[PDB]
Amino acid sequence: YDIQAWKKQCEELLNLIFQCEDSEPFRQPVDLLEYPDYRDIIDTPMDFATVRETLEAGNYESPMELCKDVRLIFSNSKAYTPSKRSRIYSMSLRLSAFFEEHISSVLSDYKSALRFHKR
Ligand SMILES: O=C(NCC1CC1)N1CCN(C(=O)c2ccco2)CC1
């Protein structure tokens, strides 16, 4: 019922995501010299370095907020991709599955801890 445990759990999950070759495209912002139209399509850029920095700054209040920003990485890839069979989009789907498989217990435990705190 540790209300704070989600933060280190998310740090370790981000470490695992940074070890995944599938995170390569999502570790830093999109360069506009490489993708000049990116911001015509994507209103809110997001990447895993930004998520990690936000977490380490103490600027997430809950793992739900972190989850929303991670899910934005993946929705941005789905919105930007010209094809559902693109390399970078295909990498996003595997990384998303990995992320969802691991974040589920982090969210469940946090929400359970908060309920216990308010019992
Ligand atoms: O340049 C990127 N990353 C930073 C570079 C890797 C170090 N991008 C990742 C996001 N992105 C897509 O999701 C996408 C879908 C289809 C094609 O690209 C655009 C390219």
User: What SS3 class is residue 99?
Assistant: helix
Residue 106 CB partners (closer than 8 Å, separation 6+): 6, 9, 10, 13, 63
The structure was resolved experimentally with: X-ray
Q: CA 112 to CA 12: how far, in whole Å? A: 20
Cα-trace Rg, the chain: 15
Residue 2 CB partners (closer than 8 Å, separation 6+): 109, 113
Q: Using CA positions, which residue lies closest to atom 1 of ligand 1?
A: 30
Q: Using CA positions, which residue lies closest to atom 2 of ligand 1?
A: 30
Q: CA 9 to CA 14: how far, in whole Å? A: 9
Give Cα 2 to chain centroid, integer Å.
22
Torsional sign, CA 70, 73, 77, 79: positive
Q: CA 68 to CA 20: how far, in whole Å? A: 20
Residue 82 CB partners (closer than 8 Å, separation 6+): none
